[PDB]
Amino acid sequence: MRTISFFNNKGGVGKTTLSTNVAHYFALQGKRVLYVDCDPQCNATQLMLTEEQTESIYLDEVAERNSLAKTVYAIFVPLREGESQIAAEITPMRSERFGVDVLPGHPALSQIEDLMSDSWQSALGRQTGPFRRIHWAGQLAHAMERDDRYDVIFFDVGPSLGPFNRTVLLGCDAFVTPTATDLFSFHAFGNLARWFDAWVTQYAEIHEGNMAEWKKYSADVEAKTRPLRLGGFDGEGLRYLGYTTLERFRGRFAAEAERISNSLSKHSNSTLLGHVPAYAEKINSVAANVYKALFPNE
């Protein structure tokens, strides 16, 4: 059970199209894929699901709160109420087009972004409670892997790079970063590398400091901590798979990409998965490279 994600500061329509296409490809390689839309904009959601399915979730008054249970917002209800365990009981929807179950998004995730910022804050203070709450990402990945419901999970994040999106990377085993190559796009991609190095180090403390604290007040801590896939599938942490372009910076990109790769784990590769402009000729190239890196074993 692996988790991938296509993170990016710039953010846009191309990042969400690359994501969905790669997901589709993994599906073709005979793999049960789950696509979780954690973007308030719900771009990937309103793309993989038909209007039928769409107006099916966001169908007056209190009856609207029925969508909060049919989307991804659902898994957070318990965490919001104080508890420290997501709701494994999720029910995604099949995407006929892409052939991958997708967990519909919801513009109400803006409230979950506040829940994560407050959690990440307290977690800094070595508060075991919210500490294991920022691990909701891996907590979902673990519930899936355990019930053997999916082989791969795609976490589609938004442009933001605050407390929330951070907690999404914590659930990822790897991630790619699609860029644009223009001036502003690159200037942003540069600031992105700086950001990683920053929060990854902060987390490194969050982890060490919380684990040591918990451990000194319990012995079953080694088990209560299993449900939140710490470190990923191999415990080696988040891994950088490389980047993708959508010129004058041909070097500056591959240069800053290394800073990102180095900033993270050792298994981190900083190659260039390819470019994305009958057409599936280029996308196939990327999806396939992202696949070989995620599943080196034939």
UniProtKB/TrEMBL annotation:
CDD domains: ParAB_family. Residues 1-195 form the AAA domain. Gene3D superfamilies: P-loop containing nucleotide triphosphate hydrolases. This is AAA domain-containing protein.
